[PDB]
Design a protein around this ligand. Structure first.
Ligand code: CLA
Ligand code: CLA
Ligand code: CLA
Ligand code: CLA
Ligand code: CLA
Ligand code: CLA
Ligand code: CLA
Ligand SMILES: CC1=C(/C=C/C(C)=C/C=C/C(C)=C/C=C/C=C(C)/C=C/C=C(C)/C=C/C2=C(C)CCCC2(C)C)C(C)(C)CCC1
Ligand SMILES: CC1=C(/C=C/C(C)=C/C=C/C(C)=C\C=C\C=C(C)\C=C\C=C(C)\C=C\C2=C(C)CCCC2(C)C)C(C)(C)CCC1
Ligand SMILES: CC1=C(C/C=C(\C)CCC[C@H](C)CCC[C@H](C)CCCC(C)C)C(=O)c2ccccc2C1=O
Ligand SMILES: CC1=C(C/C=C(\C)CCC[C@H](C)CCC[C@H](C)CCCC(C)C)C(=O)c2ccccc2C1=O
Ligand code: SF4
Ligand code: SF4
Lengths: 31, 739, 30, 107, 73, 29, 61, 140, 80
């Protein structure tokens, strides 16, 4: 099942930092 | 005026970008949080320690799963001396087609990374044979790491949350951790070797299904209780034992040959079984010493405060005042953390010193690059654990230290004569450096002038003796286990040197790293190491002892541990704080471990290639280090990619250049300091409010330059990461390109 | 190597520490 | 630039022992030293080194070799100036000894 | 705008602005809108070589409040 | 004072320094 | 003490701690540290004079 | 060990004796060092390995230069110590530091050769060291 | 802002008041010293942490001390 690399690596490469940075930027800039 | 960071109202009321950076470097500092009390501190550290513990088991499970699913472990069993292991597989979209063909290696379908951490040798030694045991142990560590993630959550709930007196019960940790964490676990691993790993070493499968049926010994626990323990040391694995087969096998489970297995060139598994069994008895007995609620045992607070040796009045133990040290170790957490990093830092290097000379893993002495990486890894780990020992020891003297509770004791008497400690530390650093650098430059000029016989070469005749006082015939000193008429050789009253015929076979062979042959090139580098240890200690001790103030600046305790300076007054005070003496030392600590690992690596490149004469001639003068090691070995590396093509070393050729760039970037934060950069950002703030379309958007946090203490962190971070990655790309590919 | 089935068991079992890590990291405060 | 210029053209400067280009072999290593020596002044600060002298003046006060002119660390501006003069000296002299021993051999 | 500084000059002469550059004061009461109080004292000492010690730094809030903060009396 | 407890242990350790050198000089075997 | 008396210093935060000074002038009523001591070696600031209390000094002449 | 057979017996030391490089313009300075280095111990490489043990057949390596150095090095300290003892009881003492009082420095230089007879005299009189109550110290 | 502590050892030299560039310091009368005045810091919300006031003080050790605290807009020295 070597096709899981095609679906975990782009999520951790792209989706994981986009979801993390967009959470943290809205959390540090929160009155 | 935001609510981030939660743990500080002084940082959360910062309009600049300093708010963001100081949240990161004060987040895990639990002691400086807002409103943190004493018992809330320990209850939060204890549950955090379940968090770091469960990272370790989740880390070690990915080593098992990525090998079972993507590596070639079952293909590595058949021939461990030529089959090249596999760590994980590459899914990189950015690869070109000649860079998929170059990394399709070790008999695999796709691009794979050759494992240089030696975990196939450790798993093959301890009995694991197929890819299903690796997967089973992987899934077990998923559950065993979740058992700690639940435990840290459970011990934060209000009636499951431990009290303060539970943490400061120090005599009960020492009984349970020595007997149970050290002793039972050494006993359990001896049970794992005897039941499983030693029968797996003889071609005899023992798994979870048939370990209750099969016995490790055909005698079978009857000679244990009757006292006939010599039955366990009957016919061992012979000198023709082919590993994991039944040829030349034995029935013994606890044996004491000493020395190495003749094929794998590792320690005997029957020797390790009687080892961890004997360690287990010495620790369970050690864990029944201190006083708990059962009204028996030694009491440490009474051992410190004792003043009477059999009627004679003394000042304390060894007639030295150790009173109040129990209330100094136990009440402070930085005294404990500063202490135990020194304890863990000693043993970490002590692990590395005994794993190249005494290999304990099957077929690891012949897989070279896995052995060159494990030495250099645990040496650099031992570096940070020793620098942080003095670092967290110096946070103790600023923050936690109380001179009234510690009045008159041995830790007070060090702070009196602290100018005598730093002076004689400053002497040995200069006494070695003036005369070790002097003899390299002497040998450099003398060889350069074509007359190399005028070199000052000193045989290390005080370490020549120890290797001959351990049984090496090669020098002809004829003492002390190399003298066959010696009292130490024969063990005169009892003659019980069982280990000694197997030890002298191992030390007198030139086919291992056991007590390597030393010469005049090894004289200068051990005194160069001693230059690096006494000088790194000089910076760390002087920053520890002067942490509470001195002549140029008294009351440094009022300013905390990390503050920039005290201004340009009094001639200026740049890098005056106790944090700044942590800071200068990590240049030396990375330096000294460079010297101990340039010298480790180049002595073994002569052993592994059969050319011992290259090191012994050329390691006396500093061109032979520069030419025959740095220049000559980086030819396989740098040709990892050239205009003709690529090969499998092109990551290490790319990481080598990457390391030279992170290293050089860190100079920018150290040569140039802050006030140049705040006057540069104030021109970018101007030209953003004036640009007509781009001033629709605007910052929430005002851009300021990095603070003075911050870009000494950030400067040391680019320096240290680039120092590691440069050598780690040179260590691997110069060894894995030559074998 | 291991079978294609066994990889999915490892992923589903890995949600059990993934859930518990989210519970611990939020019980330790925001 | 690393393979075909710095690595490949230095094969005449470091292999030059026992010959007439021996001084360029010694100035190549000797200038790598002075370059690296300059970083002690650039990276560190003045206020560390003044504290260290106070522990060396003590051992000089004890045996009555106390100098009448008091020792001080180099000032903040001078510690930068020493660190750039020793930087430019060892960096250029590396290249001075590298250009000569390469081009006095292939020319 | 914030921190107005006023001073009375005997005549006109060229001084140096704290924001960089040289201007020319009038004769009589002057007025300069600066960014921070640090500019006004660094200007107020530059007036001392012109023998002027009659300078007053205000504090203009964005609401329109002008608080006299130097001197206290 | 004549430091008895300091010099008592320094002469013990120096006697260990001289004993190991006797093995190295073949005085004791 | 008197103008010319060598004294010693016991103030730990002072630069000339356990060093020999020379009293230049002693005042009468105020400050609480009314003794001007002209030292012979300079501190980091470059000065060589300071004020000290009456009980702060140890006369050695 | 390792293979410290003496240099007169070595095939390697005699092979290094045939391609001698003249040190000084003495035309046999190439030869008049190899016969002098024959009593030393050349290993497998052909180079004399010095012995800092203290053996009296090997006293020329370390034992003889150690007495020779420590006489000269304890000289320079003692001359520099006794000068600073003298200038402290003068009018200024800072001028006499950078700008040497040559009338006082020259008697101290000639005095020196009984510095072991003077340092032991200073040691036993208790005038070598100073009191810890008279040296400035840092706050603890 | 920062924190300016003034101890009782100063002599009324008026060198620290004539050196703080945001004019935090001022002299108040005080019957202790010979010059009969002590420095006082009634406007420490304006202090920028410059430590010009510690550089100019004669007394050993310093009668004035600046403790670097929480940094607002006035103490960062931001014109923006
Ligand atoms: C921390 C441990 C760890 C690390 C560093 C890696 C590293 C890697 N894994 Mg792997 N993995 C692990 C544990 C780990 N594995 C475990 C326990 C499992 C079983 C569930 C897997 C299952 C797995 C699969 C199925 C695949 C990878 C893949 C990969 C590669 C690409 C990264 C990726 O997509 O992640 C994938 C990550 C997951 C599937 C889930 C992560 C599981 C661990 C337990 C999370 C650890 C989080 C960590 C502790 C949080 C701390 C962050 C830190 C910065 C503070 C890379 C070699 C891919 C690959 O080989 O590409 C070629 C791929 O297809 N991994
Ligand atoms: C071993 C690693 C480790 C551990 C156990 C912790 C643990 C902790 N950190 Mg910490 N931290 C670490 C590494 C670590 N940190 C590193 C490397 C950095 C970067 C410098 C930080 C930066 C940091 C900041 C800036 C803060 C913490 C905070 C915290 C606390 C709450 C965490 C939280 O809100 O989770 C967040 C939850 C998640 C990330 C969900 C993860 C889920 C996955 C599936 C907790 C005690 C915070 C706090 O308030 O402390 C009291 C806080 O403000 N830490
Ligand atoms: C017998 C009962 C028992 C046991 C098993 C433990 C076990 C433990 N306690 Mg503990 N504890 C106990 C009773 C016990 N405690 C009692 C009674 C008290 C109250 C008085 C405490 C109070 C307490 C506190 C307050 C804390 C602990 C902590 C810990 C953990 C230590 C960290 C760790 O995992 O290191 C594991 C270490 C070893 C397995 C031994 C390592 C030995 C050296 C370093 C290396 C030797 C290995 C060798 C070289 C070979 C390795 C090679 C191989 C890896 C390849 C560990 C799980 C800490 C923790 O993390 O909390 C979770 C912590 O903060 N305990
Ligand atoms: C804590 C470690 C540990 C554990 C859990 C076990 C557990 C076991 N051993 Mg074992 N064993 C151990 C250490 C351990 N051993 C050590 C250190 C030795 C060497 C002295 C042995 C030598 C040994 C023998 C020789 C035999 C066992 C047997 C047994 C089994 C019978 C249980 C019993 O009588 O009690 C059981 C599976 C007996 C058995 O029938 O195994 C199934 C058996 O014949 N063991
Ligand atoms: C188990 C050991 C241990 C423990 C529990 C602690 C715990 C602590 N230390 Mg300590 N320390 C340790 C080891 C340890 N340290 C070691 C080994 C050293 C020597 C290097 C130090 C040096 C040290 C200093 C000098 C200081 C502390 C401080 C602290 C406290 C706060 C930590 C903090 O703010 O984190 C914040 C965490 C960070 C800022 C992390 C940034 C650094 C990361 C690791 C860089 C990583 C680079 C990058 C990811 C690499 C990518 C590679 C890629 C490009 C290829 C806390 C009590 C501080 C304190 O004030 O104490 C109260 C403090 O001043 N420690
Ligand atoms: C070519 C490089 C080089 C050289 C020769 C030296 C030489 C020296 N350093 Mg130095 N240093 C260097 C680079 C270098 N440093 C760098 C890059 C740093 C990092 C900032 C330091 C930080 C440093 C400190 C912090 C200390 C030294 C000390 C010393 C002295 C040790 C005595 C000796 O061996 O001679 C000597 C003057 C020590 C010293 O002078 O002891 C009295 C001392 O305390 N150095
Ligand atoms: C009068 C000469 C003199 C004397 C007797 C001493 C004596 C001492 N010094 Mg000191 N020192 C001196 C000059 C002197 N120093 C000077 C000029 C410097 C600045 C370079 C230093 C720098 C220095 C350091 C950095 C250290 C000592 C240390 C020591 C002690 C151990 C010996 C040692 O390590 O030598 C050290 C010698 C040097 C570093 C170089 C020697 C300096 C020159 C070459 C000799 C001076 C000769 C003088 C100018 C001749 C004047 C003659 C006069 C008639 C005109 C000892 C108390 C060490 C210590 O504290 O150990 C406990 C220590 O760490 N000293
Ligand atoms: C050889 C041999 C032997 C011996 C051994 C030994 C004896 C060892 C030693 C060892 C040792 C001898 C070790 C040590 C180490 C040390 C260290 C490592 C230290 C460190 C420290 C620290 C770091 C501290 C800290 C701190 C500070 C700094 C401050 C305050 C606080 C504290 C205290 C915490 C025997 C007989 C057995 C056998 C045979 C062989
Ligand atoms: C024999 C021998 C050896 C050994 C040695 C030893 C080990 C020794 C020790 C010794 C010691 C351990 C010593 C110590 C000392 C200490 C002290 C304490 C000193 C004193 C000094 C002083 C005090 C000084 C003075 C002076 C002088 C004399 C001169 C100049 C000036 C002065 C002042 C500087 C060897 C093997 C190497 C080699 C071979 C031979
Ligand atoms: C360049 C430089 C700056 C300017 C640098 C600034 C203003 C920050 C620039 C960083 C930008 C935003 C990129 C940062 C992102 C990194 C590539 C990765 C960081 C990711 C982690 C923070 C998570 C200083 O402020 C400074 C201060 C003191 C000494 C030396 C220096 C210094 O050298
Ligand atoms: C090492 C170092 C020092 C200390 C280094 C010093 C003081 C150099 C002094 C060494 C020379 C050898 C002193 C010379 C003293 C005498 C002239 C020696 C007599 C020898 C003559 C006979 C030739 C600083 O003062 C400093 C200041 C600011 C930033 C960085 C640093 C810095 O890195
Ligand atoms: S604090 Fe300094 S400047 Fe102010 S009155 Fe005292 S001595 Fe003078
Ligand atoms: S912080 Fe220091 S320099 Fe700035 S105004 Fe206040 S006293 Fe003066």
């Amino acid at each position: 099942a070597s096709f899981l690399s095609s679906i975990f690596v782009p999520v951790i490469g792209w989706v994981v930092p986009i979801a993390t940075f967009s959470f943290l930027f809205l959390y540090i800039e929160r009155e | 005026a935001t609510k981030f960071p939660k743990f500080s109202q002084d940082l959360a009321q910062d309009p600049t970008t300093r708010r963001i950076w100081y949240a990161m470097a004060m987040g895990n500092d639990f002691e400086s949080h807002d409103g943190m009390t004493e018992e809330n501190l320990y209850q939060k550290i204890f549950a955090t320690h379940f968090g770091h513990l469960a990272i370790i088991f989740l880390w070690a499970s990915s080593l098992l799963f990525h090998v079972a699913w993507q590596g070639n472990f079952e293909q590595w069993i058949k021939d461990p001396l030529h089959v090249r292991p596999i760590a994980h597989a590459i899914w990189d979209p950015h690869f070109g087609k000649p860079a998929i063909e170059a990394f399709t290696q070790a008999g695999a379908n796709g691009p794979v990374n050759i494992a240089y951490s030696g975990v196939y040798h450790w798993w093959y030694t301890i009995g694991m044979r197929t890819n299903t045991e690796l997967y089973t142990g992987s899934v077990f560590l998923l559950l065993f790491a979740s058992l700690f993630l639940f435990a840290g959550w459970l011990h934060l709930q209000p009636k499951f949350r431990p009290s303060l007196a539970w943490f400061k019960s120090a005599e009960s940790r020492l009984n349970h951790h020595l007997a149970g964490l050290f002793g039972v676990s050494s006993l359990a691993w001896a049970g794992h070797l005897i039941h499983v790993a030693i029968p797996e070493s003889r071609g005899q499968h023992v798994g979870w299904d048939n370990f209750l049926s099969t016995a490790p010994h055909p005698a079978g626990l009857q000679p244990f209780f009757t006292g006939n323990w010599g039955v366990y040391a009957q016919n061992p694995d012979t000198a023709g034992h082919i590993f994991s087969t039944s040829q030349g096998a034995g029935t013994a489970i606890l044996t004491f040959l000493g020395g190495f297995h003749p094929q794998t060139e590792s320690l005997w598994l029957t020797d390790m079984a009687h080892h961890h069994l004997a360690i287990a008895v010495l620790f369970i007995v050690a864990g029944h010493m201190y006083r708990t609620n059962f009204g028996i045992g030694h009491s440490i607070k009474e051992m410190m405060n004792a003043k009477t040796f059999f009627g004679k009045p003394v000042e304390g133990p060894f007639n030295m005042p150790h009173q109040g040290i129990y209330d100094t170790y136990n009440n402070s957490l930085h005294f404990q953390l500063g202490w135990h990093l020194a304890c863990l830092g000693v043993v970490t290097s002590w692990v590395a010193q005994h794993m190249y000379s005494l290999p304990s893993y099957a077929f690891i002495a012949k897989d070279y690059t896995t052995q060159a990486a494990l030495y250099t890894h645990h040496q650099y780990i031992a570096i940070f654990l020793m620098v942080g020992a003095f670092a967290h020891g110096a946070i103790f003297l600023v923050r936690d230290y109380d001179p009234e509770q510690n009045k008159g004791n041995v830790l007070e008497r060090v702070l009196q004569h602290k100018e005598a400690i730093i002076s004689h530390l400053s002497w040995v650093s200069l006494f070695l450096g003036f005369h070790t650098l002097g003899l390299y430059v002497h040998n450099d000029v003398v060889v350069a002038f074509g007359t190399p016989e005028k070199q000052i070469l000193i045989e290390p005749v005080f370490a020549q003796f120890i290797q001959a006082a351990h049984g090496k015939v090669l020098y002809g000193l004829d003492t002390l286990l190399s003298n066959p008429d010696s009292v130490a050789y024969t063990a005169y009253p009892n003659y019980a040197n069982v280990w000694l015929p197997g030890w002298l076979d191992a030390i007198n062979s030139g086919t291992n790293s056991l007590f390597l042959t030393i010469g005049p090139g090894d004289f200068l580098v051990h005194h160069a190491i001693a230059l690096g240890l006494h000088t790194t200690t000089l910076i760390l001790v002087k920053g520890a002892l002067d942490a509470r103030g001195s002549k140029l600046m008294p009351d440094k305790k009022d300013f905390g541990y990390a503050f920039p300076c005290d201004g340009p007054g009094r001639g200026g005070t740049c890098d005056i704080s106790a944090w700044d003496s942590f800071y200068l030392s990590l240049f030396w600590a990375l330096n000294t471990v460079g010297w101990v690992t340039f010298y480790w690596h180049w002595k073994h490149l002569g052993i592994w290639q059969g050319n011992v004469a290259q090191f012994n001639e050329n390691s006396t003068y500093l061109m032979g280090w520069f030419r025959d090691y740095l220049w000559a070995n980086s030819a396989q590396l740098i040709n990892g990619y050239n205009p003709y093509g690529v090969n499998n070393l092109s990551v290490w050729a790319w990481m080598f250049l990457f390391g030279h760039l992170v290293w050089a970037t860190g100079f920018m934060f150290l040569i140039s300091w802050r006030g140049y950069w705040q006057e540069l950002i104030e021109t970018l703030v101007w030209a953003h409010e004036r640009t007509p379309i781009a001033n629709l958007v605007r910052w929430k946090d005002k851009p300021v330059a990095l603070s003075i203490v911050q870009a000494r962190v950030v400067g040391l971070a680019h320096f240290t990461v680039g120092y590691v990655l440069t050598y780690a790309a040179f260590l691997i590919a110069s060894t894995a390109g030559k074998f | 190597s291991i079978s294609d089935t066994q990889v999915y068991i490892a992923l589903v079992v890995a949600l059990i520490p993934g859930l518990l890590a989210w519970r611990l990291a939020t019980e330790l405060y925001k | 630039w690393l393979r075909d210029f710095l690595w490949a053209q230095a094969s005449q400067v470091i292999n030059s022992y026992g010959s007439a280009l021996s001084a360029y072999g010694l100035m190549f290593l000797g200038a790598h030293f002075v370059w690296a020596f300059s970083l002690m002044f650039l990276f560190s600060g003045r206020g560390y080194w003044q504290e260290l002298i106070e522990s060396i003046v003590w051992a000089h006060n004890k045996l009555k070799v106390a100098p009448a002119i008091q020792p001080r660390a180099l000032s903040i501006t001078q510690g930068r100036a020493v660190g750039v003069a020793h930087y430019l000296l060892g960096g250029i002299a590396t290249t001075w000894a590298f250009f000569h021993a390469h081009i006095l051999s292939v020319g | 705008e914030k921190y107005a500084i006023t001073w009375t000059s005997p005549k006109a002469q060229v001084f140096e602005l704290p924001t960089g550059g040289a201007a020319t004061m009038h004769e009589g009461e002057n007025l300069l809108y600066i960014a921070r109080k640090e500019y006004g004292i660094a200007l107020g000492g530059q007036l001392r070589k012109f023998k002027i010690t009659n300078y007053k730094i205000y504090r203009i809030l964005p609401s329109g409040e002008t608080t006299f903060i130097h001197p206290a009396d | 004072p004549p430091y008895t407890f300091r010099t008592g242990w320094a002469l013990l350790l120096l006697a260990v320094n001289f004993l190991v050198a006797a093995y190295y000089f073949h005085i004791i075997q | 003490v008197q103008r010319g008396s060598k004294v010693r210093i016991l103030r730990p935060e002072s630069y000339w701690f356990q060093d020999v000074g020379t009293v230049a002038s002693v005042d009468q009523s105020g400050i609480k540290y009314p003794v001007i001591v002209r030292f012979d070696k300079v501190n980091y600031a470059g000065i060589n004079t300071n004020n000290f209390a009456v009980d702060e000094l140890i006369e050695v002449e | 060990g390792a293979d410290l057979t003496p240099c007169a017996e070595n095939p390697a030391f005699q092979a290094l004796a045939k391609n001698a490089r003249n040190t000084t313009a003495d035309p046999q300075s190439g030869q008049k060092r190899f016969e002098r280095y024959s009593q030393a111990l050349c290993g497998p490489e052909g180079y004399p390995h010095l012995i800092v043990d203290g053996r009296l057949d090997r006293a020329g390596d370390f034992l003889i230069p150690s007495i020779l150095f420590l006489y000269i090095a304890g000289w320079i300290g003692w001359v520099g110590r006794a000068y600073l003892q003298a200038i402290k009881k003068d009018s200024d003492t800072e001028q006499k530091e950078i700008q040497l009082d040559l009338g006082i420095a020259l008697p101290i230089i000639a005095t020196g050769f009984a510095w072991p007879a003077a340092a032991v005299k200073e040691l036993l009189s208790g005038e070598l060291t100073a009191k810890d109550s008279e040296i400035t110290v840092s706050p603890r | 802002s920062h924190t300016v502590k003034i101890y009782d050892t100063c002599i009324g030299c008026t060198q620290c008041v004539r050196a703080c560039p945001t004019d935090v310091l001022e002299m108040v009368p005080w019957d202790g010293c010979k010059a009969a005045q002590v420095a006082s810091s009634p406007r420490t919300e304006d202090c920028v942490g410059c430590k010009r006031c510690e550089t100019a003080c004669p007394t050993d050790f310093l009668s004035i001390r600046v403790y670097l605290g929480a940094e607002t807009t006035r103490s960062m020295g931001l014109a923006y």
